[PDB]
């Protein structure tokens, strides 16, 4: 070896690793192109054997997931969600040498209140798909024991790639569920605070309308005028005390 | 991964229970609830009469001790010491504390793993067995180490 | 590489600490997580403490960190 | 950009015997271009001591350019030129056909020609004009060579000649 | 965009005797493109050792258009461009009509020859006299080449040498 | 063989690589206790400049001509706002990467090429011994030049040579609109960089007892 | 600037047999150009007591540019242009294949004359008449050369012809 080299160096002058050493670059450059192959289908059957593993574990928990994410508890009168915001504390950037900011808190509005249909579930922000792959195709097959046998560690490497990669896409959608409903629970406390708008929205009526054809009995229509947003009048805002 | 720290250095778990249960049937208490973890010792096989001296087999089992705790992996150390009604409340208190005192620095001339030791010696104050008959032969006169595991 | 021996034997990775779950309920020593708590002091590679290696291959021995320093070390040399 | 006359390597995993030369393409698995693959063929040799591939078709993948390299073949691990195949194919055949054509002309010739000093004189007649037209056959057919077959499973050498891009 | 040289799957379900040249089509199952197929013809080779299919006519169902990329052929599950057929169609025949032609000429001037040293006599005018036509016929008639037909039910590979869009 | 005496030196290169990083990482404690950047830095989170001394200057431009002093110093580098202080690992971990590729072009085949071989490659090995020991010393003398410039700075402004860096904090309330918002807005700039005083007239003296 | 004839070392790390020459490179080790490379080829003499190598495209690291600067080959450390090979590849089979032809033409042809002065029969049969299609076959293939071979593991010479940069 080249680490204590002085020993190794003396070492490997014997004539049969002169010999030996010859033999592996067709080896090296059958086993590279095996070991790709190997990591690319346990990649592959693996990641979606975890991920239907992960579907099915999702569906023995369908009861507590649709009780803890109720939007029907967080819908407004007139039929719409309320808008998504973040909040940050403690804001500090340097900008260059002698150029600094700080700032004590920030809030952003990130997706605007708008008029919805049906409450979104959760089922779609934390399903995961799955597509069955029947097909393995196995051009390039390996010679001997050893070959065979690293390509099925190797195979076996792969398999637990894909396994952590659907893990990462487990926690990415739960964090994007959980920071969207972590903004409708924000701007409902803000609400309770007094330091945003509530939404305002006018309607109009009509009584029977239409022509000799076609009639409708009434005709009500409804848009919105104030979207909620923020505040600035500081003076105007009240805090909070418990007990 | 094989490159990567596959466990922590020298972690033997079969080492573990060896010496727990070496030092259980030895007779110095050692006993597990959750991470919190108590090991007692009594006086008699650590100290002379009334003395805070430390007799040459005990090293042997202040060995055994570190070899024990430098085992996991922890932040802070608490140590105690109690002894017997023997004289007054200062001299007491004093043995207690240079007793402590002692045993923690050896501990941490050792290879302790442990970032933060704290001493506490009381004397008679807290006492466990209320039969009170002997004097440093009673196993109410005692030392005590505690810590909790940290993940 | 069986962690839980002399013990109940493996239960699980309890993977929110990252550390095997033994049927004795006790935590064992070995690690099942990347994101997990190590102790380690010693790093590979070079250029280190700067921009990492250079994405682009100098035509001589030269190898440069993004920050512009050239690590001589890891360089080749005459 | 490639200097001018380097070592390379490819993977080859189809193979074809020399032929007829055609479309032969390998895939370079590792190096500066990764997922290329290179198109090319071979030359028909009067003698068969060693078999080369002449690649000229290359592309690497994700964009559409077609860089026109031609480059040679050796094969690996020994660092010379010569193929791994057989080389026997079509000696003993021709050889054996002929020489029991030969073998029937002299039986029918020689023993008709003892008869001075009926079955014998039959095993004459067959092998006495049976002899004659496999004979001028066997020297019609007697000029097949014997061919080599690379094999599907085997890597080879890419030396370059050219610089590309 | 398809790679240069890359390897596509072709249904055949048509044979040919190996006789007349012709459109043979084979009909592509995997890929990008669905429902195409590809029209070519083969080649007859002086020596049978391979048999192939070139390929050139290739069509893309749904709009109208017929691109023409050139392509080989290989066996499948072998990776190697022979065919899988006969080739010892006609060697047995021609050689056993020369042989007993060449038998009955030998049978006339042997049986002839030991005249000096009436059916039988007979026997060797049969043989002396239908010989020789029969030899020169069959001299004339030896030439025809043993002849290879694939089948209708075993599909076949197909490597790439161009790009098409 | 010059191949081999390159890749001796390679080899010798990264073992003493290995051995001195594991030497400085066993003397781990001591280097942050001496080298206490974050007891040295200011309070506004301000990196101190760098100041050169120099004594009994002399230069010789040509003939008759000579140019003395007494002292003189220099701002190296100037102060700047700073995050987290600095290490002595920023300086002092020399990199390692391990070759494990030597690709002997010439095996050795008779003994005399073995023999040349083994002094070859410890002709390579004391170089590359050599050689990390110089890229050791350069980089020690670095950061002590560091630390000596940052203590300098230090001494100057406690014996009155040069100013102390001047800071304008500016503070707004709240700002944006009805969709972003920032509720307190305080901003800090540095308007005076520290630099020397010509008037020594303000200078102050110095004992012991 | 190179001077007008001086001499160069290489290191030849890929092999050939001198039957089909083609690219074959160098690595230059000394000197001024480091990590330089070097393409070219051999050639065929009329007698095969030397075997030089034609080394022309050189390719320098560092900058895209290839110098076409020539120059031939001497064998290191023996000061000379002849070459380590082998020189009695293909005497012996040919030599063999025909004495063995004529001695069985021979054969048949005088033990057939020693009659007058069943089983000697046959060995007159088939030694008379397989001699000569195969001493006319080896009168036909005797004029096959016999080849040299470079190695793989030994280095070269450059000895220089025209100045460059």
Avoid at chain 4, 145 to 162: C, D, H, K, N, R
């Amino acid at each position: 070896g080249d680490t204590g080299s002085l020993a190794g160096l003396q070492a490997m002058a014997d004539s049969k690793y002169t010999r030996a050493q010859k033999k592996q670059k067709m080896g090296k450059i059958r086993e590279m192109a095996l070991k790709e192959t190997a990591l690319s289908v346990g990649a592959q059957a693996g990641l979606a054997w975890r991920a239907k593993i992960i579907d099915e574990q999702l569906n023995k928990q369908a009861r507590n997931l649709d009780a803890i994410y109720d939007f029907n508890s967080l819908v407004l009168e007139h039929n719409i969600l309320p808008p998504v915001l973040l909040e940050g504390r403690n804001t500090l950037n340097l900008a260059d040498a002698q150029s600094i900011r700080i700032s004590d808190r920030t809030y952003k509005v990130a997706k605007q209140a708008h008029f919805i249909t049906t409450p979104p579930t959760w089922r779609q922000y934390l399903w995961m798909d799955y597509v069955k792959p029947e097909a393995p195709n196995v051009t390039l097959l390996p010679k001997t024991k050893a070959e065979k046998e690293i390509w099925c560690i190797y195979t076996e490497r792969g398999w637990k790639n894909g396994i952590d990669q659907a893990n990462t896409i487990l926690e990415e959608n739960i964090a994007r569920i959980k920071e969207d409903f972590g903004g409708m629970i924000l701007y409902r406390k803000l609400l309770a605070m007094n330091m945003v708008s509530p939404p305002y929205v006018s309607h109009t009526d009509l009584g029977v309308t239409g022509d000799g054809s076609e009639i409708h009995i009434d005709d009500r229509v409804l848009r919105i005028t104030a979207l909620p947003e923020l505040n600035v009048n500081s003076a105007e805002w009240r805090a909070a005390v418990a007990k | 991964v094989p490159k990567l720290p596959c466990r922590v250095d020298g972690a033997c778990d079969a080492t573990i229970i060896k010496m727990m249960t070496d030092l259980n049937k030895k007779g110095i208490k050692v006993a597990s609830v959750g991470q919190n973890y108590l090991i007692s010792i009594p006086a008699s096989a650590l100290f002379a009469d009334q003395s805070p001296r430390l007799n040459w087999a005990s090293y042997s089992l202040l060995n055994e001790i570190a070899a024990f705790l430098k085992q996991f992996r922890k932040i802070a150390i608490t140590v105690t010491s109690y002894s017997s009604k023997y004289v007054s409340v200062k001299r007491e208190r004093a043995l207690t504390l240079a007793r402590s005192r002692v045993v923690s620095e050896y501990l941490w001339s050792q290879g302790v793993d442990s970032r933060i030791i704290f001493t506490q010696g009381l004397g008679s104050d807290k006492p466990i067995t209320s039969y009170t008959l002997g004097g440093d032969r009673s196993p109410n006169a005692r030392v005590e180490i505690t810590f909790r595991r940290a993940v | 590489d069986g962690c839980c021996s002399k013990m109940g034997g493996i239960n699980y990775c309890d993977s929110s600490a990252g550390r095997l779950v033994c049927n004795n309920g006790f935590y064992s020593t070995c690690y099942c997580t990347r994101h997990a708590v190590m102790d380690l002091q010693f790093l590979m590679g070079c250029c280190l403490w700067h921009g990492g290696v250079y994405p682009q291959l100098n035509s001589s021995g030269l190898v440069v960190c993004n920050d512009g320093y050239v690590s001589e070390e890891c360089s080749l040399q005459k | 950009i490639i200097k001018t006359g380097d070592i390379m390597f490819a993977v080859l995993d189809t193979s074809v015997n020399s032929d007829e030369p055609g479309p032969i393409l390998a895939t370079i698995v590792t190096g500066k271009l990764k997922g290329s693959k290179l198109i090319g063929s071979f030359n028909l040799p009067s003698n068969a001591d060693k078999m080369v591939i002449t690649f000229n078709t290359m592309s690497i993948p994700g964009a559409e350019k077609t860089i026109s390299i031609s480059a040679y073949a050796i094969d690996p691990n020994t660092a010379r030129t010569a193929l791994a195949s057989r080389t026997n194919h079509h000696y003993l055949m021709r050889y054996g056909s002929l020489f029991a054509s030969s073998f029937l002309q002299g039986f029918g010739n020689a023993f008709q020609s003892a008869n001075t000093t009926s079955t014998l004189e039959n095993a004459v007649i067959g092998l006495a004009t049976v002899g004659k037209a496999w004979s001028q056959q066997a020297q019609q057919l007697f000029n097949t060579p014997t061919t080599v077959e690379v094999y599907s499973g085997t890597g080879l050498g890419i030396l370059f000649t050219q610089d590309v891009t």
